[PDB]
Design a protein around this ligand. Structure first.
Ligand SMILES: C[C@H](Nc1cc2c(-c3cc(Cl)cc(CCCO)c3)noc2cn1)c1ccccc1
Length: 261
């Protein structure tokens, strides 16, 4: 079943031209779409109705949309209306041309401390907005921290997001991201998936000694076994880690491949 070259919706009655392929996720596939009138460029998440043949699965996406729809923040992927024909459900989104922070981590391994400061700040600032509006992401990873042409972090993929474990699980994930960014490998990463779940449950990780004491301290508190002892979102920004060392306000695109100078 072919995805139409042009995508029109009943509501806004605008025409979206399906352009270059961008990636995929599970059953969903993403293409760069262009508004044929305004020429504005968007990322079109295309989901086939055949994957949502079961009404239960058709709820998971309508929840995701209802949460993403309500959102407006310079650090969360912009929502720009959704729609459907008989075959596909189309979600029009903000275009992040520099892929995700995962691609960066893969290409870069362990990034520099100022880079982690910049990347974390912007991510935490987005997570704050979410938490303030009573939204928990629940599925935060480097692949969900997208990047645009100005290297701005934009949180996406609200597939497991909920509205009110609680807010403290998102602090946990952020502790993992900070770990991975500074260390260069995920803290509970193993070949075997079952082993990872054991590592998480037993709280088995170890920050190498090569990492900054102040940085390792923050990580540890973020990854604390007692969810009530993990820091709050507001408490993260003000941590010594962000305020003591050098923190750039901008990052070059070169950061996708090599450390900045
Ligand atoms: C370059 C492009 N840009 C881009 C991609 C998106 C997506 C998206 C949708 C789906 Cl079904 C799958 C993926 C792949 C990643 C696996 O999760 C992303 N939604 O919104 C966007 C805004 N921009 C981009 C490509 C790969 C990773 C990341 C960003």
């Amino acid at each position: 079943k072919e995805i139409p070259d042009v995508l029109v919706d009943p509501r806004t009655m605008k025409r979206y031209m399906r352009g270059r392929f961008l990636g995929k996720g599970g059953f969903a596939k993403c293409y760069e779409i262009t508004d044929m009138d305004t020429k504005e460029v968007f990322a079109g998440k295309v989901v086939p109705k055949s994957m949502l043949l079961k009404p239960h699965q058709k709820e998971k996406m309508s929840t995701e949309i209802a949460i993403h729809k309500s959102l407006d923040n310079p650090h969360v992927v912009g929502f720009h209306g959704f729609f459907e024909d008989d075959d596909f459900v189309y979600v029009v989104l903000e275009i992040c041309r520099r892929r995700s922070l995962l691609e960066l981590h893969k290409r870069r391994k362990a990034v520099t401390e100022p880079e982690a400061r910049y990347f974390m700040r912007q991510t935490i600032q987005g997570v704050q907005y979410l938490h303030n509006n009573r939204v928990i992401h629940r599925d935060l990873k480097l692949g969900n921290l997208f990047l645009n042409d100005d290297m701005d972090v934009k949180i996406g993929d609200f597939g497991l997001a909920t509205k009110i474990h609680s807010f403290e699980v998102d602090i946990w994930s952020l502790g993992c991201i900070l770990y991975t960014l500074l260390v260069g490998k995920p803290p509970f990463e193993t070949s075997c998936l079952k082993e990872t779940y054991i590592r998480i449950k037993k709280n088995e990780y170890s920050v190498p000694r090569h990492i900054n004491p102040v940085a390792s301290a923050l990580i540890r508190r973020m990854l604390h076994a007692d969810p009530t002892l993990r820091p709050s979102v507001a408490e993260l920004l003000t941590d010594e880690f962000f305020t003591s060392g050098y923190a750039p306000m901008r990052l070059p695109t070169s950061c996708l491949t090599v450390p900045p100078r």
